[PDB]
Amino acid sequence: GTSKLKYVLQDARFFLIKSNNHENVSLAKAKGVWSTLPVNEKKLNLAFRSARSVILIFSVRESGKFQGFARLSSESHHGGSPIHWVLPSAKMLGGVFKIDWICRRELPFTKSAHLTNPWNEHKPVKIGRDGQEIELECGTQLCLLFPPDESIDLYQVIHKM
């Protein structure tokens, strides 16, 4: 069902993550981690303190799709296991966020054409820079459009809230 998902998304904040390649999203899906440039790191750390859930919605550039979404489980930290990102240069990144995936399935942009983001001039939600915040209602409806991921159990994520 969709009820535990709606509970996790209640009063959440949402951010668009744009990856240059599929390899980095595959690493994030396998290891449960993301890293971003310091300007976005600071925004995500502020958001993590401010909201019950902070949701990252991932899209690989030129793919025409979103590849899934995940919830921050920590602020960023330094000095863990090093991550061999494909950088498009590793010293330029900030710390590492731990994330819990909520959906690892794809959603094509053609299915989100009716959703506009007020925080980006009401452009279609697919449009945005890496780190663009997505307003609550747009972000909630976007996450509810993804196919259900029946491999994930949100019981443990609810306990982290």
Swiss-Prot record:
Location(s), subcellular: Nucleus; Nucleus speckle
Domain of life: Eukaryota
Effect caused by changing L37T: Reduced binding to N6-methyladenosine (m6A)-containing RNAs
List of residues binding RNA: K18, S19, N20, W34, S35, W85, D130
List of residues that carry Phosphoserine: S81, S89
Coiled coil: none
Effect on the protein of changing W34D: Abolishes RNA-binding and ability to influence alternative splice site selection
PTM note: Tyrosine phosphorylated.
Effect of mutating W101D: Does not affect ability to influence alternative splice site selection
Limits of the YTH domain: 12-146
Domain remarks in the Swiss-Prot or TrEMBL record: The YTH domain mediates RNA-binding.
Quaternary assembly: Interacts with SRSF1. Interacts with SRSF2. Interacts with SRSF3. Interacts with SRSF7. Interacts with SRSF10. Interacts with CPSF6. Interacts with KHDRBS1/SAM68. Interacts with TRA2B. Interacts with KHDRBS3. Interacts with EMD. Interacts with RBMX. Interacts with ZCCHC8.
Functional description taken from the UniProt entry: Regulator of alternative splicing that specifically recognizes and binds N6-methyladenosine (m6A)-containing RNAs. M6A is a modification present at internal sites of mRNAs and some non-coding RNAs and plays a role in the efficiency of mRNA splicing, processing and stability. Acts as a key regulator of exon-inclusion or exon-skipping during alternative splicing via interaction with mRNA splicing factors SRSF3 and SRSF10.
Protein name per the record: YTH domain-containing protein 1
UniProt lineage: Eukaryota, Metazoa, Chordata, Craniata, Vertebrata
Recorded name of the encoding gene: YTHDC1
